[PDB]
Amino acid sequence: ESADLRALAKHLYDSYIKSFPLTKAKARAILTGKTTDKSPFVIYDMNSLMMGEDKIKFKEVAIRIFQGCQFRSVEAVQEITEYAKSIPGFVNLDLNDQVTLLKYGVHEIIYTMLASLMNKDGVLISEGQGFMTREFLKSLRKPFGDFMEPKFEFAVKFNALELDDSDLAIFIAVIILSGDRPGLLNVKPIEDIQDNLLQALELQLKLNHPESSQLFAKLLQKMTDLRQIVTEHVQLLQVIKKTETDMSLHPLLQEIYKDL
Ligand SMILES: CCCCCCCCC(=O)O
């Protein structure tokens, strides 16, 4: 029945709120400087990174920015893992499959959600107290300058669909439960859940965005851009592991990469 899927759409939206402090809705309130529900300090040059630590809670600059972005990713994983637990069925799967689903799944969700924190011109840093311009990032030293850039590229395409937090909650739940993923001992239970989630996503898209012709199809197509961006990410990473074999990396970010 439609009613059953509607109930699942709501259950996941509830957990999404509970698990992600910076909603897309909060983000686009901060970004659209109209509603000064607290406006961000912005960082656009080296000499403004200073008052970023002056006014905001947060070893060469380009490295220290990169480490700070890497730290927001472990926090992003922690939250994503918290959200998965709530997807009905998930905790019931084989444990080894729970991990692989997360191993491949988190990154794709990192950048889906990061799109909420972006406009064409920059990205919210530091829970929303900051805003760092895409140009300052692009201007960084050359093993880091073009690191974040293809994220802005994806975000601008993706932001165009203009999704809700209530749509994203079902969409990120789909991404997690792929079955497409290498090493899954047990695929059909994963696939059975995802087909029910794609039902929830489909329906929700039609109710929440009716005049938006074939958004469901257009959304699922954006998973093409997602995969491709995670891949040039890991190759960008392994390069920094040899340009600065003195720079560390969080262990929980280590496990996301058994490459090849
Ligand atoms: C540290 C709070 C996490 C939110 C975005 C992280 C960006 C922080 C930074 O790059 O300095």
Author numbering: 207 to 264, 275 to 476
Lines from the paper:
Thiazolidinediones (TZDs), also called glitazones, are synthetic agonists of the peroxisome proliferator-activated receptor gamma (PPARγ) nuclear receptor with potent anti-diabetic efficacy in patients with type 2 diabetes. Overall, the structure of the PPARγ LBD is described as a three-layer helical sandwich fold composed of 12 α-helices containing a dynamic or flexible internal ligand-binding pocket. The PPARγ ligand-binding pocket is among the largest in the nuclear receptor superfamily, ranging from 1200 to 1400 Å3 in crystal structures with three branches described as ‘T’ or ‘Y’ shaped. Branch I is located proximal to helix 12, which forms a critical part of the activation function-2 (AF-2) coregulator binding surface; branch II is located near the β-sheet surface, close to the predicted ligand entry/exit site where helix 3 meets helix 6 and the helix 11/12 loop; and branch III is also located near the β-sheet surface but deeper in the pocket near helix 5.
We solved two new crystal structures of PPARγ bound to GW9662 and SR16832, an analog of GW9662 that we developed with a ligand extension that weakens synthetic ligand binding to the alternate site, at 2.29 Å and 2.73 Å, respectively. Similar to our edaglitazone crystal structure, we observed electron density consistent with a bound bacterial MCFA in both structures, which we modeled as C9. In the SR16832 structure, C9 is present only in chain A; and the 6-methoxyquinoline group extension in SR16832, relative to GW9662, appears to have blocked the branch II C9 binding mode, pushing the C9 closer to the cobound position in our edaglitazone structure. Compared to wild-type PPARγ or GW9662-bound PPARγ, we found that C9 binding was more potent for SR16832-bound PPARγ despite the bulkier addition in SR16832, relative to GW9662, that points towards and blocks the branch II C9 binding mode. Inspection of the SR16832 crystal structure cobound to C9 indicated the increased potency is likely due to hydrogen bonds between the aryl ether/methoxy group of SR16832 with the carboxylate head group and other aliphatic protons in C9, the latter of which can form weak hydrogen bonds with methoxy groups. In support of this hydrogen bond network, we performed density functional theory (DFT) calculations, which revealed a net attractive interaction between C9 and the SR16832 methoxy group (10.3 kcal/mol) and a repulsive interaction with the phenyl moiety of GW9662 (8.56 kcal/mol). However, SR16832 preincubation lowered the assay window of activity to a large degree; smaller MCFAs (C9 and C10) only showed a small increase in TRAP220 peptide interaction, whereas C12 and the endogenous UFAs, AA and OA, did not.
